[model samples]
Target: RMLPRLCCLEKGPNGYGFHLHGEKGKLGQYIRLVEPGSPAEKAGLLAGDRLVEVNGENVEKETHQQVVSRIRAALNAVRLLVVDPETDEQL
Candidate 1:
């Protein structure tokens, strides 16, 4: 059992969207939508293109890996939400 804690920041509009990093030499794919003007595509990032990094950190880098691990740990932490009988109950 672990405790739940928040990890990772939300992505802004101009920044990269949802994606995951893989081990070194393992391709990391970034899914792109059509509306972003084509800058991402023009840069060689396709809808299913394998993206290796964003900004400078290699999604494969140890730092990124650590971040992911921390997130996983946090998720494992929260098992259930205790309810107060006087305040709330499932109907």
Candidate 2:
């Protein structure tokens, strides 16, 4: 079973040190990459981790664009709930 993990990131002047990937009508958006020595990596974010929530709100059903919008709409910081791939079910 996949267990959830937490990642918090403060918006930087440039990028957030992470990118969200996945397309509409497909799987949920996930952490596609985490920049080295960036806030995301420091928060323990990892590639392939499915993003379940953004800023305490569920994003499991949203499209990638929608998810990114919500994340960007977050206040100073973003709170993410992610689950590492374990089984082949949702891959």
Candidate 3:
């Protein structure tokens, strides 16, 4: 619960190359998957990581669309604060 780590990923030509899952009422957004060889994977993002922030903005209180919009609005790279699943802490 305290191992928050930052993952900085460069957006690929196609996209950021990751998936996030957080429906309304969920505690936080979760990293659902990282495409193989994608920027997310290269940046050390793993499935099950709980997303705390995007580009330094707290997403804990944001709606799913808000989070997605923030990520999609990134010019080149995106920074994420995530809590890892294994350690239940930040990566």
Candidate 4:
């Protein structure tokens, strides 16, 4: 099936992009059948902004497996910055 074991991953996905990151296009062979949140953001807006780091450790170019491994270990508390926006008004 699909992401049959992603609950643990999406557990803290309420704020952090665990869902955003998880939406990094995993095995996810289901193009049209993926959940509602999966297709739109996952394919377009979400993937548009990828990660530059895991915890200042910066898994900038780490392999997919590396992301999961370290992500869990450091899942305790994650603080991040959002990058790349074409439209910004003012502060």
Q: What are the Cα lDDT values of the candidates?
A: 0.33, 0.82, 0.87, 0.38
RMSD of each: 17.7, 3.5, 3.9, 12.1
What's model 4's lDDT at 22? 32
**TM values, all candidates:** 0.29, 0.81, 0.86, 0.40
lDDT of 2: 0.82
What lDDT does candidate 3 reach at residue 25? 55
Give a tens-digit lDDT track for model 3, residues 4-91: 9999999987888889887455767888888998989999999988889999999987777888899999979999998887754576
Model 1: per-residue Cα lDDT over 1-91, one tens digit each: 2332222233334532333344346443333342354333333333433333333334433454553443344422211111111224469
By the TM-score metric, which is better: model 1 or model 4? 4
Which 10 residues in a row give candidate 1 its minimum summed lDDT?
Answer: 76-85
For model 4, how does the per-residue alpha-carbon lDDT over 48-71 read when each residue is reduced to its tens digit?
334455545565556656755655
Q: What residue runs in model 3 are displaced by over 4 Å at the alpha carbon?
A: 23-25, 87-91
Which of the two, 1 or 4, has more lDDT?
4
Best first by TM-score, ranked: 3, 2, 4, 1
| Backbone clash total, candidate 1 | 2
Q: How far in Å is the alpha carbon of 60 misplaced in model 4?
A: 1.8
TM-score of the candidate numbered 3? 0.86
